[PDB]
Design a binder for this molecule. Structure first.
Ligand SMILES: C[S@@+](CC[C@H](N)C(=O)[O-])C[C@H]1O[C@@H](n2cnc3c(N)ncnc32)[C@H](O)[C@@H]1O
Ligand SMILES: [Mg+2]
Length: 156
């Protein structure tokens, strides 16, 4: 089995602000690349009423959490998990893509996004500047003692 692996979730306030910044609404399909405990797709479904939210995650410890959290939050009808490497998972149906990634995956991520996402798709990232792209918005989010940066991109 896969042993314990540390992770970094996005604080709840930053999750909300990300979805606000991307103007997430009911008609949206939200994909979270590396969804961890599922909080972004759960909040999108629970608080922003999205028709569909899909979390992609490779770590089974995280997936087990996320699956339970979906039930605990009463959003099993609209939120789901895809087990896999998000580089290898089809995200083309997304109208909004969220990311909080702490490794240098920029060079790899850019071509998959341009290839699979339709023009007008919004990409919103927590402290992940996408090198070579021009952000529509760069927003500082104050979170108690903590500060965060959120980037918004619009495909095309
Ligand atoms: C920084 S945590 C963020 C979790 C969540 N999106 C949030 O903001 O609260 C990054 C997550 O991405 C997952 N991850 C990293 N690389 C991945 C990959 N290639 N495919 C799927 N998941 C990945 C990790 O296992 C971890 O759960
Ligand atoms: Mg932060």
């Amino acid at each position: 089995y896969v042993p314990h692996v540390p992770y970094v979730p996005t604080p709840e306030k930053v999750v909300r602000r990300m979805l606000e910044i991307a103007k997430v609404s009911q008609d949206d399909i939200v994909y979270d690349l590396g969804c961890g405990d599922g909080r972004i797709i759960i909040t999108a479904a629970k608080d922003f009423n999205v028709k569909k939210a899909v979390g992609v995650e490779i770590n089974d410890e995280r997936i087990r959490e996320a699956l339970a959290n979906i039930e605990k939050n009463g959003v099993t009808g609209r939120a789901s998990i895809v087990k896999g490497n998000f580089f290898e998972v089809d995200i083309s149906e997304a109208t909004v893509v969220t990311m909080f990634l702490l490794t240098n995956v920029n060079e790899m991520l850019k071509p998959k996004l341009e290839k699979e996402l339709k023009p007008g798709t919004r990409v919103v990232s927590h402290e992940f500047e996408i090198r070579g792209w021009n952000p529509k918005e760069v927003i500082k989010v104050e979170d108690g003692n903590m500060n965060h940066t959120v980037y918004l991109y619009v495909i095309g």
